[PDB]
Design a protein around this nucleic acid. Structure first.
Length: 577
DNA sequence: GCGATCACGTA
DNA sequence: GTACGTGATCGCA
């Protein structure tokens, strides 16, 4: 039973409650709140949002940090309330983040999935209530209210079992002093958003458009025919049947036309380099020009990404609508779209600070490899130093190609890519790649020991852990299938590395947000991008930030090797280089 | 409309 | 054959 309340009453404002502030729009920025459920010691209550969000006692209760609330995905409700001018405080337990720390592979995205983890099933999955895709819709108040009360009652019942397992895993502080405080920082970053110079994007767009139609006209000429260049099937007919170009790699359906195999087909026909150029420009025009323009809010002229904090298996953040963690950087006209991200106020600047080789530094510390640790204590170029060791030469003898290959080995560790993957990246035979790895392990025997020990430890315990006690379970580690076991072994090696880097950057963000308020600076965190923090601040604060931000990031944790931060600022994201 | 598929961008 | 998010095509409704 539950009270479908018409008025907010004193008893709904207990100082501990499960709270549900339901936002059904996937993108919760400036999105409607469809209902409110409160469960506490005195009862279970459903509130209409027009009612509750106009009651000064309820609003005051939302914003009172000493009135503790338990929620599922508090950041969604916090941001939706931010857009209504209302602060949400006192969230002492977030069920979504608790479920994510306990087992990231469950894919827990609604209360029901988390509840299943504890054999609690008196709640429906959200897709059963709301529908899927097109037939998505808010149901009637009786149906809506019951579902919201049931989610709140589940949260109420589930806090204690979740906190108990968290404590057993030594993850209670990880939840309470890292992920939940970070969730507030992320909410504030999303709400603030990034200002976008839509005029320059549209200018870049009109320019790729004229360059696309030139190259595209060239392609039809070289094909002797018009076709959908965007359709890898049609393009595959033209390259491999009409032009008789050799088939170097097959895709599950037909012929691969990846930039991979196309570069190897370029000597055979001038159409290929044109297809590659069309691909590059169309990626930018469609995904980055047209994509970003679609999600700039015309009220703010800002993008307000949503950070997904309970998605990745490694503990990294992901971001959506737009995804600002894949904005081009390696090729120039790609990276020039970062010129479209500007400060949101005049006389402000963009400030970007990034960890230099944080994953390899984490590895040096976890593996305690004396050579790796020396390399970083000397602040060497790690790729040059790896090439020196692998190829047994002095620094003066490292050719760019030796460095490129040492860099690919290092990248292969940081991402745990397969031995077959190193051979594929370096376009070498699989055995040539094997003796590469071997040479590396002879130069870094501590990394080899770490590789072998962490795989044994994963087999033994069932999981691997990061510096801050995040864990990833690896059931596939015993599978009698080779490819399935290899990936699980590679995740055993890579997850403590990537996940520890992720932990460090999140602690950096927490420590930085406190120091900014402590220093009374107007600088604000805007974006985190796996290893980079991006802020905007008044011109007048750049100098204090050049000292402050790298200091906070480097001191976030004490490793056996220094942490190194590079930082830049400029009047756009591009120029913070 | 909705998925499966391919391709590609970042870290 | 790493972590993910997005756009296009395409075949089946």
């Amino acid at each position: 039973a539950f009270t479908l309340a018409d008025r907010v009453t004193e008893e709904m404002l207990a100082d501990k409650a499960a709270l549900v502030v339901e936002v059904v729009e996937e993108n919760y920025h400036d999105a409607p709140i469809v209902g409110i459920a409160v469960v506490n010691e005195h009862g279970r209550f459903f509130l209409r949002p027009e009612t509750a969000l106009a009651d000064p006692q309820f609003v005051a209760w939302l914003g009172d940090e000493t009135k503790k609330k338990s929620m599922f995905d508090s950041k969604r409700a916090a941001v939706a309330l931010k857009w209504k001018g209302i602060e949400l405080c006192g969230v002492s337990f977030d069920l979504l983040l608790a479920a994510y720390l306990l087992d990231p592979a469950q894919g827990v995205d609604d209360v029901a999935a988390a509840a299943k983890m504890k054999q609690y099933e008196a709640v429906r999955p959200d897709e059963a209530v709301y529908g899927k895709g097109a037939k998505r819709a808010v149901p009637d108040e009786p149906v809506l209210a019951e579902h919201l009360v049931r989610k709140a009652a589940a949260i109420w019942a589930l806090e204690r079992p979740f906190l108990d397992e968290l404590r057993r895993n030594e993850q209670d502080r990880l939840l309470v002093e890292l992920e939940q405080p970070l969730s507030s920082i992320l909410a504030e970053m999303e709400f603030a958003g990034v200002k976008v110079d839509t005029k320059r994007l549209e200018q870049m767009g009109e320019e790729l458009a004229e360059q696309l139609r030139t190259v595209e006209q060239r392609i039809y000429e070289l094909a002797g025919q018009e076709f959908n260049i965007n359709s890898p099937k049609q393009l595959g007919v033209i390259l491999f049947e009409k032009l008789q170009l050799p088939v170097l790699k097959k895709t599950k359906t037909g012929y691969s036309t990846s930039a991979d195999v196309l570069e190897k087909l370029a000597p055979y026909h001038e159409i290929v380099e044109n297809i590659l150029h069309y691909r590059q420009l169309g990626k930018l025009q469609s995904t980055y020009i047209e994509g970003l323009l679609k999600v700039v809010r015309p009220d703010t002229k800002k993008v307000h990404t949503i950070f997904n904090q309970a998605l990745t298996q490694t503990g990294r953040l992901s971001s959506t609508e737009p995804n600002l963690q894949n904005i081009p950087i390696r090729l120039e006209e790609g990276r020039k779209i970062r010129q479209a991200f500007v400060p949101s106020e005049s006389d402000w600047l963009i400030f970007a600070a990034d960890y230099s080789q944080i994953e390899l530094r984490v590895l040096a510390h976890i593996a305690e490899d004396d050579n790796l640790m020396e390399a970083f204590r000397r602040d060497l170029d790690i790729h040059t130093k790896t090439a020196m060791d692998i190829f047994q030469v002095s620094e003066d003898e490292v050719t760019p190609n030796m460095r490129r290959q040492a860099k690919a080995v290092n990248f292969g560790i940081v991402y745990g890519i397969s031995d077959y993957g190193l051979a594929q990246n370096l376009n070498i035979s699989r055995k040539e790649a094997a003796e590469f790895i071997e040479r590396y392990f002879e130069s870094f025997p501590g990394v080899k020991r770490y590789m072998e020990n962490i795989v044994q430890e994963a087999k033994q315990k069932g999981y691997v852990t990061t510096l801050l006690h995040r864990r990833r379970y690896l059931p596939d580690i015993t599978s009698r299938n080779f490819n399935v076991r290899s990936f699980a072994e590679r995740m055993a090696m890579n997850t403590p590395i990537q996940g520890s880097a992720a932990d460090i950057i999140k602690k950096a963000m927490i420590d930085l947000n406190a120091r900014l308020k402590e220093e009374r600076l107007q600088a604000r965190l805007l974006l985190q991008v796996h290893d980079e923090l991006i802020l905007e601040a008044p011109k007048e604060e750049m100098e204090r930030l050049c000292r402050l931000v790298p200091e906070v990031m480097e001191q976030a944790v004490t490793l056996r090797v220094p942490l190194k931060v590079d930082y830049h600022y400029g009047s756009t994201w591009y120029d913070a280089k």
